[PDB]
Amino acid sequence: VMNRLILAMDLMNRDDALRVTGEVREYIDTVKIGYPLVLSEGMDIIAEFRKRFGCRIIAGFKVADIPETNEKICRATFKAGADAIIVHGFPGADSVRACLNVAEEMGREVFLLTEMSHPGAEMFIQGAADEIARMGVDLGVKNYVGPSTRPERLSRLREIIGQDSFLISPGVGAQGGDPGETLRFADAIIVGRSIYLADNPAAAAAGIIESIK
Amino acid sequence: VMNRLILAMDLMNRDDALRVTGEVREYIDTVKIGYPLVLSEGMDIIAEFRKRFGCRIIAGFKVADIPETNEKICRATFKAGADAIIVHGFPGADSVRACLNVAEEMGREVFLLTEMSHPGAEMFIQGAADEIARMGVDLGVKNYVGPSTRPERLSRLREIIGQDSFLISPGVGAQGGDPGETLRFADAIIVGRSIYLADNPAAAAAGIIESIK
Numbered sequence: 001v002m003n004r005l006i007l008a009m010d011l012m013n014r015d016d017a018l019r020v021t022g023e024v025r026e027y028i029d030t031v032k033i034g035y036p037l038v039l040s041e042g043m044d045i046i047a048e049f050r051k052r053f054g055c056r057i058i059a060g061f062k063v064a065d066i067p068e069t070n071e072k073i074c075r076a077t078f079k080a081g082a083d084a085i086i087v088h089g090f091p092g093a094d095s096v097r098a099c100l101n102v103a104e105e106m107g108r109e110v111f112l113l114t115e116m117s118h119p120g121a122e123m124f125i126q127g128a129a130d131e132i133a134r135m136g137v138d139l140g141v142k143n144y145v146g147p148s149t150r151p152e153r154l155s156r157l158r159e160i161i162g163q164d165s166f167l168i169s170p171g172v173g174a175q176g177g178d179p180g181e182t183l184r185f186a187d188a189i190i191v192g193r194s195i196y197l198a199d200n201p202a203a204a205a206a207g208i209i210e211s212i213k
Numbered sequence: 214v215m216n217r218l219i220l221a222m223d224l225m226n227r228d229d230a231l232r233v234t235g236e237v238r239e240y241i242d243t244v245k246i247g248y249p250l251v252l253s254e255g256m257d258i259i260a261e262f263r264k265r266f267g268c269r270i271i272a273g274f275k276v277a278d279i280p281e282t283n284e285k286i287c288r289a290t291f292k293a294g295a296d297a298i299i300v301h302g303f304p305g306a307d308s309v310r311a312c313l314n315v316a317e318e319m320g321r322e323v324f325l326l327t328e329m330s331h332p333g334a335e336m337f338i339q340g341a342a343d344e345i346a347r348m349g350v351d352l353g354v355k356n357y358v359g360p361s362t363r364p365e366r367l368s369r370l371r372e373i374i375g376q377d378s379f380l381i382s383p384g385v386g387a388q389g390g391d392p393g394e395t396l397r398f399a400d401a402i403i404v405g406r407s408i409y410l411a412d413n414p415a416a417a418a419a420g421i422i423e424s425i426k
């Protein structure tokens with residue numbers, strides 16, 4: 001990932017989303033598109049981003065359904081052009097495998113979300129996170145998502161998945177996570193609001209990159 | 214809910230989804246639309262269903278993001294016409310409250326998904342399900358989703374939420390759940406494939422209703 005920086009484009013209208021992404025295109029080559037934008041503008045927005053920016057697209061859908069439905073969601077998502085999809089690990093191994101099956105068939109990637117970055121994650125997710133990470137390792141998952149907001153937890157996750165695995169981390173900026181500290185364990189950071197809500201997105205992205213040069 | 218039967222419309226193309234729903238419209242007044250259909254045809258499909266069938270629409274999105282993103286997803290979904298949205302409880306209380314806030318503002322409903330119906334749910338969700346249910350009760354949640362595939366678990370969930378709460382349950386038919394047994398605890402059953410994949414959807418729906426009379 002270019003500059004170890006992934007833009008979380010959660011604006012909800014195409015003009016703004018495309019405008020802001022364009023303002024920071026020189027600093028990134030990977031964009032995470034989620035439901036706020038997709039539900040507001042349609043799945044065709046993914047193809048629009050790929051054609052306009054020639055960027056990698058990670059669908060931050062955090063799939064969390066039964067196996068059969070997970071397969072359908074992944075199929076629809078990859079057909080739309082997504083290079084990868086983020087899947088929740090809490091629902092179990094069968095639900096994860098369903099996503100892996102479609103990813104293998106279509107030559108795409110799966111990112112396993114272990115622990116989440118928000119406060120509520122401490123209630124149920126945190127206690128299962130280490131086991132969810134191990135589950136991913138046992139199934140050969142190579143891409144993971146961990147919390148920037150809890151460096152020691154992110155560090156433990158890194159220990160479990162190993163140095164070879166790819167780890168990205170949200171929660172940098174708006175949620176309180178620090179770019180540099182997070183990159184001690186993650187290969188790339190996910191940044192949304194700190195950039196897309198900034199007075200000048202380009203300066204914001206440049207500032208982040210400057211602090212981690 | 215008419216006939217205590219909610220149709221899970223997970224077909225992935227407009228023509229088929231509308232045709233099948235039309236075939237069983239005389240037996241239902243509530244349809245659950247999820248990502249397989251919405252990602253394939255766009256969120257406008259929700260409005261299409263409401264105007265063509267005058268039915269209640271439950272968005273089976275199982276929202277499972279951080280609070281801020283959950284708010285955006287719920288807002289986009291309710292603006293699209295959804296009467297209710299299904300929210301995952303495992304991400305915690307703040308993520309649930311975010312959904313409740315938007316539902317309150319827009320005069321819509323939130324259904325809290327406690328334990329899931331597939332095998333993988335036993336790995337992490339099951340052990341947290343009773344507490345997730347209690348969390349919902351403590352926050353005043355009145356609508357819940359529990360597994361048809363585990364009658365005793367569904368029964369325990371009913372005990373926790375009380376007779377007052379509304380409980381719907383997926384996993385009937387394709388996943389092995391029995392309509393009658395499930396309705397001993399749930400107010401309504403969610404049925405997808407057993408109906409929409411049937412040679413004769415209308416006959417399939419009638420058959421289910423027959424054994425429930």
Ligand SMILES: O=c1ccn([C@@H]2O[C@H](COP(=O)(O)O)[C@@H](O)[C@H]2O)c(=O)[nH]1
Pocket residue numbers: 008010034060113115116117118147170171172173174175190191192193194278279282
């Ligand atoms: O544990 C997680 C999983 C997903 N995200 C997502 O990552 C982005 C973080 O954006 P922001 O807080 O930098 O604005 C959003 O798209 C959000 O939905 C998190 O924040 N935390």
Ligand SMILES: O=c1ccn([C@@H]2O[C@H](COP(=O)(O)O)[C@@H](O)[C@H]2O)c(=O)[nH]1
Pocket residue numbers: 065066069221222223247273326328329330331360383384385386387388403404405406407
């Ligand atoms: O625990 C859960 C939560 C959601 N669903 C959803 O309920 C429907 C069940 O459909 P079917 O198995 O009758 O086809 C699908 O939309 C599915 O995604 C489950 O099956 N189990």
Ligand SMILES: [Cl-]
Pocket residue numbers: 034059060061062086
């Ligand atoms: Cl995400």
Ligand SMILES: [Cl-]
Pocket residue numbers: 247272273274275299
């Ligand atoms: Cl659902």
